[PDB]
Symmetry: D2
Subunit: 168 residues, 4 copies
């Protein structure tokens, strides 16, 4: 399913979001953008950034994807600045009508729902079609030592991919 693009929105190379994103990439054989090892600079509006290979690659990969799984940690009740910075390079030219499944990684408790709301609002702002199924990944869902997701989360992610494909 290389027509699906998984975007790992944590900038932390050891972040939980990246464990979940890499799991999805390998389980469903997707394309991948990893914001913990990206050469993207901070967007600054200057024309020269349009010529940067990292920016050109981001735009090309997002535009070509048939569907996106968008993962972000919840940092201070919003998506990560790293993910929002990447989105600021993009527009409805890359996203319009694209099916998108959103996942937030949180710290437990009630966390993650504010990031999901922020992601849904921004995705609608680029005219994406965010599917109803959304997920919060808590620490209980991530095995740090084995670098994978829990059994129940794996079932949930399969259901999410099935719904994403239905909207594609």
């Amino acid at each position: 399913m290389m027509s699906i693009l998984v975007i790992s929105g944590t900038p932390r190379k050891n972040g939980r979001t990246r464990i979940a994103a890499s799991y999805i990439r390998d389980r469903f054989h997707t394309d991948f953008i990893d914001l913990s090892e990206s050469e993207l600079p901070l967007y600054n509006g200057e024309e020269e950034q349009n010529e940067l290979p990292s920016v050109q690659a981001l735009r090309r990969q997002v535009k070509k994807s048939a569907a996106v799984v968008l993962l972000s940690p919840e940092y201070h009740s919003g998506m990560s600045g790293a993910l929002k910075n990447a989105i600021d390079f993009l527009s409805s030219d890359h996203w319009a009508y694209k099916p998108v499944a959103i996942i937030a990684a949180a710290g437990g408790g009630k966390g993650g729902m504010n990031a999901l709301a922020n992601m849904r609002t921004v995705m609608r702002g680029v005219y994406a079609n965010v599917i109803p199924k959304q997920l919060v990944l808590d620490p209980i869902h991530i095995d740090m030592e084995r670098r994978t997701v829990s059994e129940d989360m794996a079932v949930s992610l399969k259901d999410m991919i099935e719904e994403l494909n239905m909207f594609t």
Copy 2:
């Protein structure tokens, strides 16, 4: 009023948000953070970033301020990635109970309200006290040639500063 800190959240050196932010800085004699000329890197969670002068300065300036005017452009129905990246370096240690006035710069029409909602949610996430008065700056409110705000917007900004001081 150097106890007020104005944060210009656009990364664009010629951005409208920066014209409004600089106006407030000069009119009310505030401290200033300009995310269009910052050395802040993308937050990456690594311990080494705690030693960076740009990060130390951001934390020191926010923590010491008695109140903040937080300005951001609305990019894709959210605050800028540049501003969110800066906030990701911070915590309730720098923001708790601080009075904050939020301003979004938009393109006209209905724009700006989604950025304001995102800013209010993230600010509450660091335990700031966002005051009720909020503003959207549209192109009609910004004189690009004279690099200042319109007469009606200047009145609105004075009312905002007065309310911010009341909550301080």
Copy 3:
């Protein structure tokens, strides 16, 4: 297109939302729920309400519809209490995967976007598929004397119905 259900969420019989909703009903030959002339009581959780004809009709009409146009005025930065009360009688049994187009009627200026966000969040909460195209109807878009919508709004509504049908 009686498979489309238009829900007029204003409780005001002379409200602008109802002018727009009735326009859509007549232009596209839809089903109709009018919350300005409904016998629905306030939801109170009591079992007896499940037997009320108004509640049974609301549930039957929503469940059978292939798609919904959901209109609400923005009252205090949210959808109307009348519309939310009606939704409180419903569940994912009536809404799951249903394509929904949301419209907010506002007072001009920046109004309407908070109602749209509230509507999108609640609709996702019942598992509906809210389409990307959303509209705010301002007073300039409503002819009170002729009880219809402006020419530009009529074009926008046709585009909205076309997109809604695509997602159906």
Copy 4:
């Protein structure tokens, strides 16, 4: 503390929100509005509603309060229609600058955060000052048999009242 007004926003007489709201009323000796036993009709915009005793009482009680604890269940990712209906009778005349603490009652899991966001947005829409401290009451926090809150929730509510008083 009769200058504090507690608003129980569930319409269900046996609802968990009402157990928490009644606990606060009795513990802190507050004024009380109970939307499970209210004579308020659905707001309909007609002038005659301004003369109804229930509407006059709601407006008088809210306006006179020095601070409000606003409780609502989360119904479909928003505040209850009953509470929103009551707010639709009100305006900034009753709420402007009033300190407000928001509490959502949820079903467990991740629930409650969408109601809190909706409540914060609507309260800002009437110019209230919603304090940073917010709470979600889950079933674990409510003793149905004893009709009171758990020990840890009682501590949290005392901290909330202390913060509300600070903003008053």
